[PDB]
Amino acid sequence: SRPGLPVEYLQVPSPSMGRDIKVQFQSGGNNSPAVYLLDGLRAQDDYNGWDINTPAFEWYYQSGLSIVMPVGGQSSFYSDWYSPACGKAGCQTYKWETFLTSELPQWLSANRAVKPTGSAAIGLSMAGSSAMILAAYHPQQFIYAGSLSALLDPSQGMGPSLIGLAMGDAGGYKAADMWGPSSDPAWERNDPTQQIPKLVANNTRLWVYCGNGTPNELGGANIPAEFLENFVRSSNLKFQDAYNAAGGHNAVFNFPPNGTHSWEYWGAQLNAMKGDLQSSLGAG
Numbered sequence: 526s527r528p529g530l531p532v533e534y535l536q537v538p539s540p541s542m543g544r545d546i547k548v549q550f551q552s553g554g555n556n557s558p559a560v561y562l563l564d565g566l567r568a569q570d571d572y573n574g575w576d577i578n579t580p581a582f583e584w585y586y587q588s589g590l591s592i593v594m595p596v597g598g599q600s601s602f603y604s605d606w607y608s609p610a611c612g613k614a615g616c617q618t619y620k621w622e623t624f625l626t627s628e629l630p631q632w633l634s635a636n637r638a639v640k641p642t643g644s645a646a647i648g649l650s651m652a653g654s655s656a657m658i659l660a661a662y663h664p665q666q667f668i669y670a671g672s673l674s675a676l677l678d679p680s681q682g683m684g685p686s687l688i689g690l691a692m693g694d695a696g697g698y699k700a701a702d703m704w705g706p707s708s709d710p711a712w713e714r715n716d717p718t719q720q721i722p723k724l725v726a727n728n729t730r731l732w733v734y735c736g737n738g739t740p741n742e743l744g745g746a747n748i749p750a751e752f753l754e755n756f757v758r759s760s761n762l763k764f765q766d767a768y769n770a771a772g773g774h775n776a777v778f779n780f781p782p783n784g785t786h787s788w789e790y791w792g793a794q795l796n797a798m799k800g801d802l803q804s805s806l807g808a809g
């Protein structure tokens with residue numbers, strides 16, 4: 526049902542960021558595996574975009590999977606930032622890798638008996654690369670990573686400056702505050718194409734989606750959505766080639782001849798990957 530589901534609106538203290546992170550939550554039951562649904566570049570501070578734009582909770586109720594939707598961190602790339610995250614609205618502390626990989630799972634285990642290990646992270650847009658970086662560096666916790674419509678080589682060429690533009694347009698943040706000048710090693714570290722050997726060695730299950738910029742009847746037929754999806758598509762194709770070349774063998778690659786940078790297409794993927802998540806994480 527949409528109303529009447531056991532959906533919580535948690536307030537999870539983050540020592541590292543000095544505030545309470547709101548977290549929308551639906552348990553799949555005691556000791557259930559978690560699915561972290563990471564929001565896109567323009568993440569709002571009231572509700573995660575996955576809740577706003579999809580019936581995700583509804584789709585995953587009684588799936589044996591806990592659904593975890595952190596709220597906030599627009600333009601954060603769910604990263605630990607070098608300096609305060611200062612945008613149009615003011616400064617906030619961004620230490621999202623710390624939060625997602627310790628404070629949150631520990632709180633969820635202690636307070637809701639959510640299994641802290643063997644989780645998936647699924648992100649769209651900005652959070653698509655973040656999902657893979659979470660699995661790259663925290664494979665115990667994240668054994669599955671979904672990346673929807675993300676720029677997958679952000680440290681390369683125009684990469685850093687395109688990221689700067691977007692953060693600027695979304696809340697007016699500056700990429701220097703996050704991973705520093707493009708010279709800083711933080712860029713390579715958070716580039717999922719660069720971290721492909723990790724993904725392979727950890728045998729991380731991947732779900733990699735990117736549309737082609739052509740809208741079908743689902744909608745999203747507008748130029749920005751079309752131009753954005755097409756623009757990030759090649760990094761998705763190059764990721765695929767590199768991953769296979771590095772001996773990758775645990776990914777689903779989803780590059781249909783349709784799809785724009787719009788929630789209609791992302792929802793469709795989240796819905797599509799439920800049974801795969803259940804098998805890969807042992808929901809049964």
Ligand SMILES: OC[C@H]1O[C@H](O[C@H]2O[C@H](CO)[C@@H](O)[C@H](O)[C@H]2O)[C@H](O)[C@@H](O)[C@@H]1O
Nearest residue numbers: 565566567568574650651749750786787
């Ligand atoms: O980066 C994730 C955001 O994707 C959407 O916004 C992008 O694409 C829109 C077209 O669908 C553009 O209008 C917008 O300027 C882009 O940033 C989505 O609207 C947001 O909810 C996501 O956070």
Ligand SMILES: OC[C@H]1O[C@H](O[C@H]2O[C@H](CO)[C@@H](O)[C@H](O)[C@H]2O)[C@H](O)[C@@H](O)[C@@H]1O
Nearest residue numbers: 678682683684687755756757758759760
């Ligand atoms: O940095 C983003 C991507 O840039 C290159 O490719 C882009 O540039 C052209 C458009 O201006 C097209 O080749 C394509 O649509 C874009 O993705 C680079 O080749 C990619 O690896 C980068 O992800």
